[model samples]
Target chain A: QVQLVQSGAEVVKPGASVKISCKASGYTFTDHAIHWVKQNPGQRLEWIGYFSPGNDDFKYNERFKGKATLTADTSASTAYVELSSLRSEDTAVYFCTRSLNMAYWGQGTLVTVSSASTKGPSVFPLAPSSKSTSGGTAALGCLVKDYFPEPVTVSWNSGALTSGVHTFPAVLQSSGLYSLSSVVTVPSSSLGTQTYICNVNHKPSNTKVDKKVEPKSCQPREPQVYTLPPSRDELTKNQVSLTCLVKGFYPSDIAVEWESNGQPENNYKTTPPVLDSDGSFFLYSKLTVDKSRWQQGNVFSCSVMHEALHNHYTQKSLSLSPGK
Target chain B: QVQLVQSGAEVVKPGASVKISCKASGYTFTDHAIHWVKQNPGQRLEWIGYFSPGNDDFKYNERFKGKATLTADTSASTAYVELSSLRSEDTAVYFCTRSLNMAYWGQGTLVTVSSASTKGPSVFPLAPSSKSTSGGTAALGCLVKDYFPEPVTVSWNSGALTSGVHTFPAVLQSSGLYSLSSVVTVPSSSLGTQTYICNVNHKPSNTKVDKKVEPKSCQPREPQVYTLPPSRDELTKNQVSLTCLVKGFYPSDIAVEWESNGQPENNYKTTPPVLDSDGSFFLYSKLTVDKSRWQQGNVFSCSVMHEALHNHYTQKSLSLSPGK
Candidate 1:
């Protein structure tokens, strides 16, 4: 069986660190991505992030923004998440979740960071990539010196918005400096195109930067309308089938009901509906009855419902014709 | 707000113990019970158990066995689980599932169990339970040890199958001397009726015994039968609806069906059925058709289908009587 097995436990002293390993087996390791999760002893667990072993492209759970770094080695069929800053809070079991929403998992390993005992330290949270941009008026956020008082410094450069020059405003919060930045005042046209960066310098000779810019926008876009399947003519003394398709919606929560000849009893049969990852909904209903019932010429309709939009209903109907 | 937030990290050391804590505010501590879950970090969390601050009754996940223990201080509204025995394999972030499966959660505190100098002593599983019993010739089989291995010993006091004082036999196993030989005699008609006891002594010095005796044979008991709910009638939308229900049967793997006009479209149907604790069955079903459809003197029938018995169909037909 292809499986991801985690390395055994480890012990470390305060100010020390360790990197645990998760080895994958069986199938081609790169076929699926690996995700990391964090939890302390007896606490709610949070998703850390996912990384591809092939190119190491990664996505971090917003919750683990600064805490976790996902990386993998396709050649070795292995993945590693190195936790830095050997704090007691980092001592939770960590396991790997596979593609199917954690339907499969690796046995987790535990790491305990001690303060006294002397032992070799394991370096973790391999330094992340840092990049910087310039031009607009940048806000040079606060600088930290120590844990006590937690005083920080904020500075501004370029003073006002301008074209060509991007200002870098860096945010200093959560004890970590985000890509440095000072909001730069730039030309209105740059709103849809330009880029800026924030930079930071720390006591430990550490520096990093973050990038962001504005999106070009003004007028609201038109609401997209989805057309349903074409209505059909009913057949007399013959079995007939048809369906309606509704589109143009997000967060699939659409509801549909049918009315036959203005009577609820003539409603067609329906099946449970389903949703897509993008929150779109889909469902189908079927109809079948004796030929005689069709001679009365019944009508059918379908509707959609959503919390974010106004209530609306769309429908179609057909009359039965003699099938000679 | 002051929150005891935890970050993801791995720490390793050797031969030490550790404890992780979570502090909370903004709400009364005793209002809700805190649940603990053990998920290999990145894996779907599994319920480890729960701790009620009021009664202090700890419900444990049988799977966790003796791996964990829960404790809480009602005043502080804080909960704790001390994971003992620091092994490399024991490394995994432990999380506290809160609100008894409701509400928000706290980030987990990870404590790698290692031989870190700042750690404490370790804890292990408790002793096992045992027992012994005897009777004429046959050693009255003593109590079965908790988590005991099978094919246990039962010895007869004397070489003969009848008449003799029995004694417990001893065997060697991982959990020390497992006394297995204990049995009851091949009792005679009159003497065999007396009961015999099975005594067992488990770890922590707890001993318990159970008794079993033969009884005089008599006439066979009657087979218990349960009647389903009688039929009901309702008229709506030019249609009449009727329902039937049944209960009382060992093993609920039975079926029910309906028949109409010598044809069975909705003939066989089983409604919300469930199995009782003792492995019995409970079943119900409802049948309805448009009153207009039944107006032309249609024939309708209901029946029960049991695995052991033939189908039981209703003998009489419910006419679509137009007048009443």
Candidate 2:
């Protein structure tokens, strides 16, 4: 019998060094080889190096050369790997395996490289800081900067309306952190003294920042709706996914709902509003249902509500025919 | 700016205790809460607990209540979590974030808990082993037992022949480890004093074991072959997958090949031969082709070669039309 048991986790300051161990037992440990693997946070596994205690042979991946050192203790039947000159990027989990084949593995040891001097992000507003209007809709944008270890959620809120506000997805910056900017648009008629607030929420820091912009007059437009056809394979498998696309809408306030066989439908996912180059918004909602229901000739519909539509809604429906 | 930096990797024996730290800087650390997360090897992220330095507030997941203790130091702007009474299952990486949202995070700290007394696996042959024949084809099976951390590969070698050998995929046992069995068959005529070798390669233990079996004779038989049609989506995407299944073959010495318009083709994957409960074998070979060639009126075929055929071969062909 052969077995490999590994070491515990470590906490170290940046520029520090650490060594981990893997002990082998229940076999002639020297008869087999030992290998080390590295796994960065949320990343794929990487092979680091391998050592043959029997022959005192060693090999390292080009990427890990000089960054890691491997050694073995014959009397203790153990293998060791030391990582040096650690940086933030060096923070990861490392595993030791009994042989180069990696069939059996030791539990991983995590190494964190950090400095107390590191700082959190700064939240602020971008250009056109105040509310701006184009055509008849009002828009506001806020930017959060220099935050490390994403992800952050940005949302918009206002007392001017109870609902129908859309927030775009946060964007990651090139600086290895995050910088988020989102806009909220409202119809010119509905634009009042209410302030549109942008809230940046960062969980890692347990922090939240809220910035506000007054509303302005701008253009308003309704959305155009369309649905994608279900694939043949999905239909044959008794599974169906229907997608509704609402595009080219201004004053980003809009709501999309699904209906099946003339009844309200749930069990769907809706994407956040996407800002187009022209300042119009695009949104997609998908509903998945059993194909058997569609085979029974059910009707599915997507309804859109917008402030510009005077208490009315626009809807598009598709009816599935039997054996089609 | 706000920043969170974690600690290094640690190694500890089972039943030991480990405390990992995350330091926050460049912000009022007391203003933001710190959250801890756990990631077991090859598993999903799990929220452990949260600590607010400002008020010394603490909350923990019920699952980790006794296993983890969360604390913080306002003066040092640091948060810590101590895991106690560690078990093999406690081997994992822990991350610290600034807030409950986990937008920002510290690099993970891996904790491995192990013992030196653990034993390796024991591999041996099962009952009715060695080489046996039914209808002229000879077969042998080797079983490996009580192995941990899985993913062991079993291979075959023989001095009597070169090609036509196949090893089945390994099967897992109910003991949470693995048990592997593989069969290698050869023609009775080709079997002489030469031995059929079974090689079990285990990486965790860095070991390999080889066992040999002598041959016997049984009745010999030919194979049955068939193909599945390409799906509609594949045709529309200009990609096609065609599968050829060969079953009920004896001796396991057979070759399955693909051909395009009468010319031998490559670029296909063939599954290892699978042994049926009755000793007959089954195999599948799939060929992926560009639909453009099929649309241009080309024919694809599957060819089989077996010793029972005596210099002859069995073949099947399909030619797709311009439209469905």
Candidate 3:
């Protein structure tokens, strides 16, 4: 019948110290010891120390010897732990457990120590601004602001669109946070009573926002390509490597395949698509063949299928020569 | 640079009203209206209403009109939403956003409405009880208490121990909360310098606990087996069913498989092991074959492999003769 209740979260500046308390009840206070445990930002748990009110004695984990001080108040049946020399690494959740066996634990309290020391980002959806229509086409712009830690992913979802809908890159301000604006364009025929949703996924802050799209938007745009060959030493080792890089394409759904001498090759590997600053997608596919095959001068090609290309394929080919 | 700061979480009793506040800063508060949003438990986003401090006007969604009221204090640059006639369905996270577009949102405030509501269960590792010398084994117990809603899962994890590790069913006290106790037994030879973890997964409170095993004194036992045959009416309906029940086994790691005519059968399903009142496990494996096949008098059997049996297997078999 022992219990431990923890305090609320705290945000402190670097080099500042903070003291946390856990109140215990429902049992004889001095009969048991209380232990403090820490869980870092990465979720690693460590035992900090223990306080036995019975004898006013303390025991510290070697790693936390100088960083933590354990104390208790027998009259109030509460235990306290003070952490000093605060740094960003000190940002963690701490718990107070009752009894030496750690059979009863308090809810964790989060302590964040940082120079800037800001809480999670606040998000807001913006009104659709300006609408334009050319020969049977319409465009709309959705905006969100005041998200911190820079990078944010914004996409549009609607009944009229699928995997290949395009979005513009987010704009980051000098203030260190971000202002995301994405525009999605569709044929005038696609515009109806259906609602479009602008979805923002921000990993750093653990935040997600979805806003209904309003009318009034306009405009759109594809990827760059590159290839790297194996080094001279690798060539001498009878290994020939070919890499194809595709960059800066909107609407992330794309298929990349490798072919040698008109036959498909399965020995190559492709990276998962990466999102670029301007809301375009980038990826690389690499194929390795023996020097003997390279000497035979078999032509290797990387073909990409993208929705923007409108049913046609874009490709890059490589034909290696005999070793020098 | 608009930011909305929300209040901490609140747990209120049913039929009680709670007013949550959101303070706005870093921008001209009157220039943008504050919108309130609600997300009910396991439900999607819902726009509650909006408060325009500039004019002291309110706009509410038809669905939330009777349940929520939005107001703003222009002098304090803050917005408030009062929820009344609270029910369990009102348990949700609420966010105050700047502007009707919802592009900006405050960190959400969780509002839990439950008469029996308490925080997560507190768990502790208990000492091992009783040592044995047949082959040398040790038993340990873990305790979790004061958890509301009466359901929680207690499990054990250690070097290669799984499934058949025994856990006693939770003991529900008169106070409407739960206290769970589970004991695990392992070979004393297997306990060398390795830690056993007691894991509690509680769904209603969205909590998980992991505590290392402590030694005390305890007992060792195994399960009793039973088989239930399909009724005559079921056979005449062209449906044939057989169920194998394994009850009263301690230390949860047991393997249960089905066989037909001495060949392993795959067309059957086994329930995940359930903990019983006495710290043993109970499970049922069911097989449903065609009535025509049952009429053929083919034999079906359920086999169990347990550590306590020392590599030996226990089985129960059944055969039906011509449809009833």
Candidate 4:
């Protein structure tokens, strides 16, 4: 494991000089570089230049040019940064990260320049996740985090569920808390057919967290169809434009058709479906027809096809009536 | 000792998913946040969203929205990022830095998301440094960096000076090399009165490096003074402005004076001194003298006073000696 373990927190008086160390493990030291990044209390992170252990090179953030001295100990696999002329402004968490792979990081060294200092933990259970590893068999994984003092336990619904269970190691966090994981193997079929209770207990804190996990099902909604009659503009124009609206449908896939009585009308435009926040969709199709044909009592309709719609509920029609 | 220790080098085939972990220590897991940063080969670091183990909440870089899944195991004190649907473009080193004190860092875990993989180290001896710890006693420090395999030793002046010497742990560099420092205490007078040999040896590589250090003294340079005769304008005018130049002097403080045969002439103009790169100063002063007095064989002289000059060398006098 490539690791950057830093020295413990420092509480020093103002004007005192402090040197912190970041120890590197798992990779060849000097194959890369170590950068020092600083974060003042409640301030944004600032980039201090990095030194290449390979070349004994130093690049500094102009602001920290004289304030920081970055040195390394290659044979010891550690990097050191000494900050001089310390003040309240120099108090911060300094992190060392890898040069080539910015991903590797240090937990952070809290430098409390002058004076004072000062959690329990929170318990969270991940949803019981099961996978079909051996077709019928599944794995149960329950996770927990945000606590200190290390000792924690996970209890299943019954005593019979503990035969093949395994709890992994606890990892420490910079927040000073810890996290843990426990898992067990089971039949995949039972995962979907049964509900389980996962309870977590911390002896050190004397706390408990309970969670229930169950199977889930999906629901589909059908689109509502509405055919609107031609407007007043059609009364003065030679052509009338009619519209059909399709709305409130799940599973976005759907089709719309325009028709005159029982005959299908090909000259119409339908908009691409639009998704809604509720996981439904909507669209409208328009067709233009001769005003005379529309006024002659020709029936026009819109038909919608969706997995959720069938029989008489699929379509709606509208027509103009004669003036009394 | 807040820290972010990442998982080791991972080489995966393209199209395969990869999950990396950043384990933190020395601080509470929840009070702060963990952000994932990545550095592709030869590319600048990029920030991915962070996950709050306390809230089980996640915020992501829109660019990595569907690409990276940030999760945390609270009880374990580790944050995780799993990049699904991996590709050639996903190859990068992922880093986890703390939100509050961006200072703590991790030694990068190299993720060679492909097939191939890999160096030794370079030796650099920092100049020897000494400071008076007890007025009469000075501490000696010698630094070495850019090496691998750790085992290295420093020998000072025939090995008789080993009584108070201590070698520190080697620090690792991302470049795969290492750095080291050794220190000892000695009489301050020895630092200036004698030269010492600092030899570094690497047994595994059969390498030996030798260096010699000595002390020196400071030398003061005298100012070069010159007084120029009256300008051609003096030939056509009654009042002649005589100029004096001072150059090539150390310790910038100096005085320039104009005199008519030893009696001080109060009316003279002098420019502020300018410094040169080699620790020297330059300036010129001008004085207006009566042309009748100058033609009467009166000497207009410019005298300079510096810590380096005394007697006849302090002044330069110029005059118009009639026709010949």
Candidate 5:
């Protein structure tokens, strides 16, 4: 995944200062515009500023001009935003996101100056989207939910799980609750019989909710995609239309768009997701461009996004200049 | 002298291709924005395109988008613009200039596609703008008359000459004449004692004219310039006014400007040039800026230009910074 990692919760005095870091991995940091925004406890998000990793040019919101400073460390591929002379109202979650191409967002960092903060977590379990090829490993995921203010525990056949289980610190979501994402990695051969149990525990209130997870094959299925060119009549009318047909993708979470010559198509149309005879879902996205441009052999690409290909590209392009 | 050199005259068939080059001298070419414009044979100038000496990013005029392409050769510190599929009316004198800071215009290059051009020569003499100090060499400059289409020979007491004279390819002026600018570098002590002759040799019309040259000093006089801060009364009224006092500058060809924090002040006022007692000229330029910005310690600089400091900075700055 082209994931962006950021600092966790920060608790500081009202008049103190704090610096938050957003570290990038693998991706070229200077190639994208990174923007910083802040959302006060349960309030609306406000733009703080944005700076270039290549230069000192910065565009800042007047309200935060003097209070916030954005900087970068090219060698470390990390971006930092520091706020000084904080006030009580500054208690908020700061978010960082890259502006261009498959925008990757940093896990929001919550800064608490003087209190104020949340709803409870609404959790669900996810099947492993990747299969281990012969004698390899498979990652199975689980979400242990609500019953906040803790004694929150997650167990996945833990009788033998101390080494294979990995859980991240709960991250505060937009809805205010700190949610969970736990992954259990194990040998592919062991999953067919292994069972999972996620416990959402809250003492004193006597609320101990436990979810039983099934041991089934939930390997992610990549979609079969094809692009169809415009018909003769459509071109005769001085217009062109192309469709990206996507089918047989699991989890019903797929986003599709079009690009003309590497530039994102500004306008597009897509049908609602439909379920096939199998449990997998399908959809189609259509784009219209000037027939003149298409006649000049301008290329168009179908850019698709899915949980299975989150960090990879599984797409196709259509153009006139070729022997298909 | 960080001079910009370009082609003199180019003649080609109606459908031929031509590429014009603007060579830079002794300056960091890429540090400034270089722009290219075209002046049709006796027509107004029009922008063709602009490109970076550092990268491929370019801004081109739609009309010239297909006919022109601007490129640069970093190793030579030169920029090139090529025009293809030349047409009869495509003839023009193309010019290039740097956009930032002290702008230097290229001695325009004229392209001739099936004739249609010109006026005659307007010549004048300028004294040596630099002198040989002690034992060092001095630069003597001359402008030879024009008698077009050749036999246009330049002779400077040829008996002792032929080696020190440097004549640029005749560059067409805005008034339509292909005027001249030729410099001769020699030992300083040899000039004052030497007599000279410049001939406008045109054999057919029997108009072989010549002008005597006096080797008197025309050494460029660098101006003494300074900036005066706003009076207490002016700032009390919530406005800050700064004046750039320039005096004792020769050649009456001085341009004065004000810049606030490195940005040129958009609006300014200046008094007419007044001749001082020593035959030097003087003038003052005034600028008004927001009082609050001044109070916040914004720095302002007086940028002065003359034939003397054309390629260098001879200026002054004023601000609230301590130890000034």
Candidate 6:
């Protein structure tokens, strides 16, 4: 299971702003960058930017230059995003997005810069966690970083839920920062896993969604075909290079390897192959082997290992010719 | 300066279509891929696609996929873009763009895709090549791939100059294309070269306009300085790493050289150094040097060269002092 531990909430006056943080646990954040977004109530979303904690360099959307600042604290494995110059328009929940697949979201908190200085649970309504049924419930959650502070309403395929503007009370952490969480549940009976999108209006980075899948929903499927091409083929020296091409899988996280003469060899070097312009996964591999050793039709094949494929291997073979 | 020689006109009925070709002259067309665009009279242009003659692959805008086809004939230094299903909507001028520097334009011809049988020069009108001195008249010339029979009109700044459309007779060549020429001169005083454009609207593709600049109107400027960083002063025992930064030039074209002990040296024995993102001048040179010679200082330097620099050179030097 992947859980996202977010930083505390920040409060800012009408003319000021604050920053929140998120620390990754379990997996290496280096595999992906931290994505930040802003949201306003009753409005659309705005994508802020993405930052690579490993490199400390980021590509930011031009719109976020003045109002949003993204940074990371590698020591604590935390990513920080600051929003400056608060206004009524800047009030909304913020979110830290990991990846589209199984991406975990933080519960949102309500931060008010209004005159009422007193702070407590009264300012935010606590959400009761829904008891999970045999079938999944459609739910939505939000986490607002600093900068945007506005009342937001999340709607789903059904009608709107109660407390369209529910608030989250902030808990003071050791760092003296305040944070909160809120969850909304939707009733669903037929769908094995219901996915409810959590959308924030002002910050358009990403729409947060929560989904539930039945335990037995996982199904076994046949592996798709994968073809491998030889990299180097020197007929005179009786050598050939081979590669692999695999297709028809979702969530493109896969590994490929080569085998020669009934014996497995060390993994060959890999290069970042291009993704098809339509955002489809297309990768290749190359391994050079002596053709003379396999000229009589020795087995030279490649197998792909992937989670989507359930560890099943898709293989391809090629043959080369030498002195007749 | 670069110039383009365009193919002659082709006449087709409403259901028929045709492909046009643009032949380049004077410069190596392979140095840059040709960009194709369509322009309707008095409207913004639409990009059809770009063809890298060297790579033989093209990337096209989705809007033009089925309607327009762009290809290159590298053997003849020409590009061919075809329009299918000839219709009035496809009537527009087409152009072959060399580079952002705005070199090379083709004199256009009209292709009429009408249900009625049409012949070349019949739909096209030609104006006199000479006009009053106030504004120099531009003669709009048309080249017809053999068998075209529509008349075309020659105009000045969108207004028809000749009383009736002039159908210039075309001569067929052994290469199977036809050529026709006509002249229209406008008052040269205030109009200058800035006043006229050749608009070709036919059945197969959209409109294309080639702007003609008067002689002595545009002059080339001195090449901008190519800036690079200072050289390295130290190398780690067996491994050497040095970075060079270069900037301050447009139309990015430049080269960098690394020398060891005042002599040209090959790249690092282990791996090639990475280049900066922009590729203007940022480069890294890494090599292995004998650590025993540390007692003496070894000189290393980098130089950037560009044709625009007018044979001038920008260099940075560093001396490595062995450490105990």
Name the top TM-score candidate. Answer: 3
Evaluated on CA atoms against the true complex, candidate 5 attains a DockQ of: 0.01
Task: State the fraction of real interface contacts model 6 keeps.
Answer: 0.00
Q: Rank the candidates by lDDT, best first.
A: 3, 4, 2, 5, 6, 1
lDDT of every predicted structure (CA atoms) = 0.47, 0.70, 0.71, 0.70, 0.67, 0.52
User: Considering only chain B, what TM-score does candidate 4 achieve?
Assistant: 0.38
Q: Candidate 4's error at B247, in angstroms?
A: 14
* Per-residue C-alpha lDDT of model 2 across residues A177-270, encoded as one tens digit per residue: 6565666656655455555677777655667787765542358866766555453434554345565666667778889889986578775556
Error of 6 at A192 (Å): 99
Give candidate 5's error at residue B110 in angstroms.
Answer: 1.7
Let me know the TM-score candidate 6 reaches against the reference structure. Answer: 0.22
What are the per-residue Cα lDDT tens digits for candidate 5 across B136-171?
666655575543422244556653566777766666
Query: Which is superior by lDDT, 3 or 6?
Result: 3
Error of 1 at B98 (Å): 67
Q: Using TM-score as the measure, what is the rank order of every candidate, best first? A: 3, 2, 4, 5, 6, 1
Tell me the lDDT of model 6 at B170.
Answer: 53
- Candidate 1 chain A worst ten-residue window by lDDT: A120-129
Show model 3 residue runs off by greater than 4 Å. A1-324, B1-4, B25-31, B74-77, B117-121, B126-144, B148-324
Native-referenced TM-scores of chain A, all candidate models: 0.35, 0.36, 0.39, 0.37, 0.39, 0.37
Instruction: Give one digit per residue, the lDDT tens place, for model 1 in B264-286.
Output: 63522344444433354444343
Candidate 5 lDDT tens digits, A182-288 = 77666556655566565545341345555555445546878766666653334565656565666668877888888876578865565556664346666656566
For model 5, the interface Cα RMSD in angstroms equals: 36.6
Best by lDDT: 3
Model 4 lDDT per residue over A1-324, tens place: 999998766566788888888899999879888998998765889987788887898789899999999999999999988989789888898888889568888988777676432223454444434456347775666677776554566777755577677778888777666788777766777886676666777654567776555433336787766565554433565445566656668887888988886689765666567664446776656565656568878788888888898652476767884544
Q: Per-residue lDDT tens digits of candidate 3, residues A1-324?
A: 667988766666789899999999888879888999999865799999899988998899999998899999999989999999898888898999987777889987778675553324444444333233444666654676776543466777733454445555555578755576766666656555556787776654667777776664451235444444443334664345565655557777778888887688655656566554446666656565655566667788788777666454777676764434
Instruction: For model 6, give the RMSD to the true fold.
Output: 28.9
Second chain alone, TM-score for each candidate: 0.31, 0.40, 0.42, 0.38, 0.39, 0.39
Better of 3 and 5 by lDDT: 3
